[PDB]
From TrEMBL:
<dbReference type="InterPro" id="IPR025538">
    <property type="entry name" value="DUF4424"/>
</dbReference>
<dbReference type="InterPro" id="IPR038434">
    <property type="entry name" value="YARHG_sf"/>
</dbReference>
<feature type="domain" description="YARHG">
    <location>
        <begin position="241"/>
        <end position="321"/>
    </location>
</feature>
<dbReference type="InterPro" id="IPR025582">
    <property type="entry name" value="YARHG_dom"/>
</dbReference>
<protein>
    <recommendedName>
        <fullName>YARHG domain-containing protein</fullName>
    </recommendedName>
</protein>
<dbReference type="Pfam" id="PF13308">
    <property type="entry name" value="YARHG"/>
</dbReference>
<feature type="disulfide bond">
    <location>
        <begin position="187"/>
        <end position="231"/>
    </location>
</feature>
<dbReference type="Pfam" id="PF14415">
    <property type="entry name" value="DUF4424"/>
</dbReference>
Amino acid sequence: NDTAVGGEGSLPIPVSQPHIKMVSELIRISGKNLNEPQMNGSWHYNCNFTFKNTLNKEVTISMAFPFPINDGNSEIALPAGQQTNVGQALVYDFLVTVNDKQVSAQRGNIAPDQNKGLYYEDAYFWKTTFPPLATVNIHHDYSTGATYDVMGYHWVRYVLKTGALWQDSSIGHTRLEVIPNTPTRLCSEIDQKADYLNPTPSGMSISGSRADRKYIWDLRHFQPQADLSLCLFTGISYVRYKVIYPWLNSDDALSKLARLSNKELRFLRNTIYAQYGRQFQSPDLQEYFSKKWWYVPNPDYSDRMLNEEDKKLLSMINQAK
């Protein structure tokens, strides 16, 4: 199991082909516990949508929120305080309001439309009545787990291609905001090799610093040709998969560790502890980790935070030299 699947967000979609256009969206995706080694991270989605009836008559349509489920084939990335099992949605506490009034959402089946980017068979359904030429406000509030994989990546996703099911090409004014609430880097800023790691859609800007580093899109007349695909590195996951695990998985680990310069071996050893926010008194180390994006000093640091992988690497360093 390469990926621990946590769930993702999706645009609302119509059951049929109505004369309803999506004129604006405000999608806020906020992270919680993403740097916890227990992998109990979550994403909280607050989504607003503006729809316009383009017909000068009253229309009643059924809207659906599609979602992935636990099909028992994969490892699941669970949010803290949530339980899962086969057949359950990878969406938690889904709440939908129609014109700011909370409505009953009924779970049911939906046929996929892979040509329009719909790959799910399960959805939450609700009715929406539009008076002649009227606008209807749709609001979503739900959570998912935080998808992660064997490469150390964190994935935050949102299906936007399905916007093609609504009238006209564009989904109008699209505002998207990803807020991890922990220090991050794009995997395309560290693993500069692959393009599937580049954030989609086009037009992303980076705002803020440290735990407040946000990823923002602000698109007008947006023709949804790509989904939201954002691959991130969190602090502990970067140090584990890009620094600790390559040495542990190495074929000539003791020979390769002996090949390191005295500075490289000193920084490698201390990175094992810097991972948990150990405070450094030595100027060379103090200055080195001050300049590392993943390093955050933790006043509650303890050597008890070192896991079996950390201890195996320290044991290898002891044997290499």
